[PDB]
Amino acid sequence: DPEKAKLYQAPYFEKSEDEMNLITKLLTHNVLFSFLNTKDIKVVAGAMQRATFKHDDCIMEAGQTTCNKLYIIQSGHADIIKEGQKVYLKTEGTAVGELELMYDTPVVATVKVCTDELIAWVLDRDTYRNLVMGTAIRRRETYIQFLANVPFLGGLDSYEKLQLADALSSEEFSPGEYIIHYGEEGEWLYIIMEGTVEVIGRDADGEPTKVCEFTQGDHIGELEFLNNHRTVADVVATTHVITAKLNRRHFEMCLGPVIDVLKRCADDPKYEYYQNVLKTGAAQPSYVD
Ligand SMILES: O=c1[nH]cnc2c1ncn2[C@@H]1O[C@H](CO)[C@@H](O)[C@H]1O
Ligand SMILES: O=c1[nH]cnc2c1ncn2[C@@H]1O[C@H](CO)[C@@H](O)[C@H]1O
């Protein structure tokens, strides 16, 4: 199969440089494209066509077999409706139609525009299957059972956990290896699948100081993403460690629903060090790419 996709030539619809930039930004922040390289992202963007909708339009309707398209929303929102009940809200940058393309099933839920207008970029099934889907199902299988047992993700439903899985890769560390170094940009969030880590801050004299430990099910790296600064501690493996790793460019999409659970670092006594870093102004800015 992978050898056959090599022979597939995606369609191209003329794009200005500004349109390519716009679409590429949507794709590089949407989890469905997480592991495509830069050349492939550009081919996929070139294959997309613009579509627009009005309030109350159905982009697709439950039961349809005639869609078979992937829509990435530029702007506007849409309700996901099952059995007449609104169950999810799709917003800018998100995709609709991916469930049907990934799992080869008729449309599962109605997608109904709920803003005045919606603008989307649309990809055909063949380009999705040949260039995008890749190992999506295997990747979901690698992580889903684990994610279902991670405390800070307990509020996400299955759909949201699978969306997070789409953006995860694995990295292992031997004892004494640094997962995060102090003073770095801060673009990786790690969820500990196995092992123990130590958080090493800097004290008032600038010397390393042990802050706390984390272990299986804990996360590190989110503080820089929440508060837009460079890293303020090292994180060092104290045992062999296995992590699932999420890039900052996917954080808003995958973990949006828990952005608040994560702000509760303020209350945790384990984050006294960090709160003092923020209070004293000891970190410089860093924003998502
Ligand atoms: O449970 C869900 N949560 C969020 N979105 C969903 C869910 N089921 C479907 N969709 C979305 O609606 C489209 C049409 O079925 C799917 O492709 C997916 O984007
Ligand atoms: O005070 C703290 N308590 C617990 N973890 C911390 C604290 N400060 C930093 N980190 C952790 O180290 C990473 C890099 O700065 C942060 O993202 C967070 O996971």
Numbering used by the authors: 213 to 501
Wording from the paper:
Cyclic nucleotide binding domains (CNB) confer allosteric regulation by cAMP or cGMP to many signaling proteins, including PKA and PKG. PKA of phylogenetically distant Trypanosoma is the first exception as it is cyclic nucleotide-independent and responsive to nucleoside analogues. Here, we show that natural nucleosides inosine, guanosine and adenosine are nanomolar affinity CNB ligands and activators of PKA orthologs of the important tropical pathogens Trypanosoma brucei, Trypanosoma cruzi, and Leishmania. Substitution of two to three amino acids in the binding sites is sufficient for conversion of CNB domains from nucleoside to cyclic nucleotide specificity.
To evaluate the binding mode, we solved the crystal structures of T. cruzi PKAR(200-503) and T. brucei PKAR(199-499) bound to inosine at 1.4 Å and 2.1 Å resolution, respectively. The structures of TbPKAR and TcPKAR show high overall similarity. Calculated RMSD of Cα alignment was 0.796 Å for the entire proteins and 0.281/0.342 Å for CNB-A and CNB-B, respectively. Residues that contribute to high affinity binding by interacting with the ribose moiety of inosine are identical in both structures and reside in a segment that we denoted ribose binding cassette (RBC), in analogy to the phosphate binding cassette (PBC) nomenclature for mammalian PKA. Likewise, the ‘capping’ by π-stacking with the purine ring in both sites (Y371/483TcPKAR, Y370/482TbPKAR) and the interacting residues in the lid-like αD helix are conserved. Residues G309; E310; E312 and A321 belong to Ribose Binding Cassette A (RBC-A), while G433; E434 and E436 are part of Ribose Binding Cassette B (RBC-B). In the ligand-bound structures of TbPKAR and TcPKAR, this helix docks to theβ-barrel of the B-site, covers the binding pocket and shields the ligand from solvent. The high-resolution crystal structures of T. brucei PKAR and T. cruzi PKAR thus provides a molecular rationale for absence of binding and activation by cAMP.
